[PDB]
């Protein structure tokens, strides 16, 4: 589909039977979801942005469905004020910016 | 143009005869630029992101050329780690997300 930007581009994503709302963010290299338990090993990581850095947990090969699209990749979990879908996954669903 | 997301969507913008590199960011409501001087009166403002809140300076009605397309709107200036073009200006140049 074609998503306009009059409002925040929030969409529905499916993770392990969990359905959540996420922000399509071209300004994020990675995907950062709010606190949630995921199976598997994870490496500690520090990610930054406006304001500074926060510590998150990195999980790999996590299956995620975005608007009926299947995607699998790295997912960072930490105290994020909002769920963020980054470029690592956006490229997988063929998402582009157009004007 | 159509922009893919395998790399950061950085583009060149022209603001006040100055050329700068900025990130097309659908995950930002506003446009925030690194410290620089702009004409006109500005009001102090606080904005937030991943690592918390920061203080910025708000300039209104500033003309900004993004890859040749003209926009005129609010530009916030402050300690952002990277220049970002937010939705306030992206909507003005007709930018959409597609997949």
């Amino acid at each position: 589909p074609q998503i306009t930007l009059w409002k925040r581009p929030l969409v529905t994503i499916r993770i392990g039977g969990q359905l959540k709302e996420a922000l399509l963010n071209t300004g994020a290299d990675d995907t950062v979801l709010e606190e949630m338990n995921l199976p598997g090993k994870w490496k500690p990581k520090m990610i930054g942005g406006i304001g500074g850095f926060i510590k998150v947990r990195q999980y790999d090969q996590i299956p995620v469905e975005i608007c009926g699209h299947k995607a699998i990749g790295t997912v960072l979990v930490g105290p994020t004020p909002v769920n963020i879908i980054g470029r690592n996954l956006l490229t997988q669903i063929g998402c582009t910016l157009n004007f | 143009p159509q922009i893919t997301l395998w790399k950061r969507p950085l583009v060149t913008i022209r603001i006040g005869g100055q050329l700068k590199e900025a990130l097309l960011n659908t995950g930002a409501d506003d446009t925030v630029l690194e410290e620089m001087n702009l004409p006109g009166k500005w009001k102090p403002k606080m904005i937030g992101g991943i690592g918390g809140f920061i203080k910025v300076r708000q300039y209104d009605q500033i003309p900004v050329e993004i890859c040749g397309h003209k926009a005129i709107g609010t530009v916030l200036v402050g300690p952002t780690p990277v220049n970002i073009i937010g939705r306030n200006l992206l909507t003005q140049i007709g930018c959409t997300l597609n997949f």
Binding site: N25, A28, D29, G48, G49 | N25, D29, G48, G49, I84
Partner: peptide
């Protein structure tokens, strides 16, 4: 890796 999410 930088996440540039920004809220007004």
């Amino acid at each position: 890796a930088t996440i540039m999410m920004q809220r007004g």
